[PDB]
Amino acid sequence: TLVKIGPWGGNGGSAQDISVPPKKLLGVTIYSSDAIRSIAFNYIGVDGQEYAIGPWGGSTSTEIKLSSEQIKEISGTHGPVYDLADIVTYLKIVTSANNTYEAGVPNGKEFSIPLQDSGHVVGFFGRSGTLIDAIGIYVHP
Amino acid sequence: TLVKIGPWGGNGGSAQDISVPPKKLLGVTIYSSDAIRSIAFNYIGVDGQEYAIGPWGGGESTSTEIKLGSSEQIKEISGTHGPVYDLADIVTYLKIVTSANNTYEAGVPNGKEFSIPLQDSGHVVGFFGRSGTLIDAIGIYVHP
Numbered sequence: 066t067l068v069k070i071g072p073w074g075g076n077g078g079s080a081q082d083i084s085v086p087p088k089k090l091l092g093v094t095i096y097s098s099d100a101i102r103s104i105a106f107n108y109i110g111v112d113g114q115e116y117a118i119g120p121w122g123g124s125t126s127t128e129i130k131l132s133s134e135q136i137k138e139i140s141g142t143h144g145p146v147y148d149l150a151d152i153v154t155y156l157k158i159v160t161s162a163n164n165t166y167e168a169g170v171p172n173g174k175e176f177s178i179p180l181q182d183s184g185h186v187v188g189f190f191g192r193s194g195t196l197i198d199a200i201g202i203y204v205h206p
Numbered sequence: 207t208l209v210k211i212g213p214w215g216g217n218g219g220s221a222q223d224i225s226v227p228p229k230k231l232l233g234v235t236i237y238s239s240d241a242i243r244s245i246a247f248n249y250i251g252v253d254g255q256e257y258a259i260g261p262w263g264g265g266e267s268t269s270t271e272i273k274l275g276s277s278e279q280i281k282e283i284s285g286t287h288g289p290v291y292d293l294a295d296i297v298t299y300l301k302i303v304t305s306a307n308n309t310y311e312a313g314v315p316n317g318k319e320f321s322i323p324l325q326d327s328g329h330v331v332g333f334f335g336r337s338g339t340l341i342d343a344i345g346i347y348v349h350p
C-alpha cells in the first residue's frame with residue numbers, strides 16, 4: 066500500500082494521475098524555466114509492466130536516472146508566474162546516493178517531504194495544462 | 207513604397223501593425239519556448255523618430271535579442287507555423303539571418319514553412335501580424 070501525498074499547487078489545468086500503482090521508479094524527466102513546465106516518469110507497476118507516463122504539461126531538461134537509487138527527499142515552491150496565480154515553480158530532489166537535482170526558480174509557498182527509514186518516492190500525480198499547475202507524490206514505505 | 211508581405215500563421219489573436227512606416231530597423235527581441243511567444247522591435251520611422259513596438263504577445267524569461275549594427279540588415283527571415291498546445295495554427299519557429307552572417311533561431315520547427323530570402327538591397331524593416339498569448343501570425347515590411 067502506497068502513501069499518497071499532495072497535491073501542492075493551484076487549481077488550473079486538468080487533474081493527472083496513474084491507474085496502476087507504482088512498485089519501482091525507473092526515472093524522471095522535468096522540463097523547467099521560471100516554472101515547472103512538464104514532468105515525465107517511467108515505473109514498473111505492481112503488475113510487473115513498465116508504464117511511461119507523460120509528459121504532463123508542456124525548455125530546460127532535468128534528467129533523473131535511478132538500481133538501488135531512490136528519491137528520498139522532494140521539496141519545492143508554488144506561486145505566481147506568467148499571469149497565472151499558482152503554479153509549481155521549483156522542485157528539489159535528493160536521492161539515496163546523495164545526488165541533488167533542482168528545476169525552476171523558488172517562488173511562493175514551500176512544501177517539503179524529507180523521507181526517513183526506507184520510504185521513497187515511486188510516482189507522481191497532480192494537475193497540468195501547459196505547465197505543472199500542481200504536483201503530488203506516491204511514497205513506497 | 208515599402209513592400210508588405212504576409213502574414214503567415216493562423217487567425218487567432220488580435221491584429222497588430224504599426225502606423226508610422228519604418229525606415230531603418232534597430233533591433234528585434236523574440237521571446238519563445240516551443241513556439242513564438244512575443245516580438246518587440248525598435249525602428250526609425252520615415253519621420254526620423256524612434257518607435258519602440260510592443261512586445262506583441264506574452265513574455266518569457268528567455269529572449270533572443272537581435273541588436274543590429276548601424277549597417278546590419280535582416281536579409282533572410284523564415285519559419286514555420288502550425289498547431290501547438292490546443293491551438294490550431296501559431297508561429298512556431300523563426301530563423302533570421304543578417305548581412306553580417308549572424309543567425310538567430312527561436313521556437314522549434316513545426317508545421318508549414320515560409321521563407322523570404324532577400325537579394326540585392328532588400329531588407330526587413332518592420333513587422334505586423336496577430337498576437338494573443340502567442341504570435342498567431344507574423345508578416346514583414348521590406349525596404350527595397
Ligand SMILES: CC(=O)N[C@H]1[C@H](O[C@@H]2[C@@H](O[C@@H]3[C@H](O)[C@H](O)O[C@H](CO[C@H]4O[C@H](CO)[C@@H](O)[C@H](O)[C@@H]4O[C@@H]4O[C@H](CO)[C@@H](O)[C@H](O)[C@H]4NC(C)=O)[C@H]3O)O[C@H](CO)[C@@H](O)[C@@H]2O)O[C@H](CO)[C@@H](O[C@@H]2O[C@H](CO)[C@H](O)[C@H](O)[C@H]2O)[C@@H]1O
Nearest residue numbers: 077078079193194195196218219291292337338339340342
Ligand atoms: C493546453 C492545455 O493543456 N490546456 C488545458 C487548460 O490549462 C490551461 C493552460 O493555460 C495556458 C496558459 O494560459 C498558457 O501559457 O497560455 C496557453 C495558450 O493560451 C491561449 O490559448 C487558449 C486556448 O488554447 C486560450 O484559452 C487562452 O485565452 C490563450 O489566449 C489566446 O491566445 C491565442 C494565441 O495567441 C489566440 O489564438 C487567442 O485568440 C487568444 N484568446 C483570446 C480570447 O484572445 C494556455 O493554454 O495551461 C495553464 C498552465 O498549466 C493552466 O493553468 C490553464 O488552466 O486547462 C483546461 C481545464 O481548465 C484544460 O481543458 C480540459 O482538458 C481536459 C483534457 O486534458 C478535458 O478535455 C476537459 O474537458 C477540458 O476542460 C486544457 O486542456
